[PDB]
Design a binder for this molecule. Sequence first.
Ligand SMILES: O=P(O)(O)OC[C@@H](O)CO
Ligand SMILES: [Ca+2]
Ligand SMILES: [Mn+2]
Length: 381
Amino acid sequence: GAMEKPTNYSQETIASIAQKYQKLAEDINKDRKNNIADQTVIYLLSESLSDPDRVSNVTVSHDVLPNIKAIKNSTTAGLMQSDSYGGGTANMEFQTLTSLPFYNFSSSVSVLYSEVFPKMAKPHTISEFYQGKNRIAMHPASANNFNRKTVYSNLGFSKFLALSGSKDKFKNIENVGLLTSDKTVYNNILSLINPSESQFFSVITMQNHIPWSSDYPEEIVAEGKNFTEEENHNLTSYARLLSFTDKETRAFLEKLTQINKPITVVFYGDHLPGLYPDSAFNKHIENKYLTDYFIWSNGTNEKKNHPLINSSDFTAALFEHTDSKVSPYYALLTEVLNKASVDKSPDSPEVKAIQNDLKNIQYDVTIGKGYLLKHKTFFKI
Ligand SMILES: O=P(O)(O)OC[C@@H](O)CO
Ligand SMILES: [Ca+2]
Ligand SMILES: [Mn+2]
């Protein structure tokens, strides 16, 4: 099955969890001034983006993420633990939207959008707080890859810009490398931002997807210890492509600062590019699964301390960064973010206690009994 049933799963356990997080949400909201629905929010999955400087045995002639590193220094930012290497985009994507961690589902599950999403009777996501007309998805490939068209349709999205398979198209398409440039994606976001509305964007880039082809900037060269010629060439091409993403990401944020609407971007790489041999990580194999993320608003930014989080934690972190009031569900997810996520020991009693709360909710809304249907305020702010 898709998930193990918690040993204490029952109507009474779900009731206890719902009452517990109802009170915690009230406690949290006493110190949260803002409303999430007053913010336009962009979830920006930057395909295969991850600083090569963290790969121990790699040397790059130049810093290829200088602007993104400066952004990370200025706002809530850190490392994201990914569930896969060289692929798995849609699984990280699912976790950002639902906040349900892949690590709590069965190891038999390969793709959440195909095996778990269709079984959810009433999937709760960050997008539900926005009007359907203001929910926009964007991905420069087929809308049907990884079942995305079905997912975004069932989430009530008004638009899904795709290269094929949707009525919604990207404008002024240009390639940087072999695939659609990040500049194209960013400029298409900007053209759809409507300051008179609160909008939710779910964006999945393609520029830095395998295979990597770039001859310039020629001064950017990269090598790894004992790498083959092919490995070094792929790393060099990838680093060159990152340099464009880095500059275009800065230019994108600069444009967002000039829009008279509160806008927050959750930016993250989904997984490392699948070009490094295991030897590249030299006894620090954890770095095979650690990408960069930041959470940046177009006004004043706090910098909350979250050096290592999971993709499923982004929504709770977004509420905290924007000082937005939470539902009981997001109160639980805030407890996960702070006390029970991937930076903590899974053997810690506190981690296990909070994870038991989460697993019961996660089971209930996927393949369980839907006991939460009787707790009408659990997902409400
Ligand atoms: O990185 P992967 O898992 O191949 O995902 C690519 C997919 O988003 C293309 O439509
Ligand atoms: Ca506050
Ligand atoms: Mn990917």
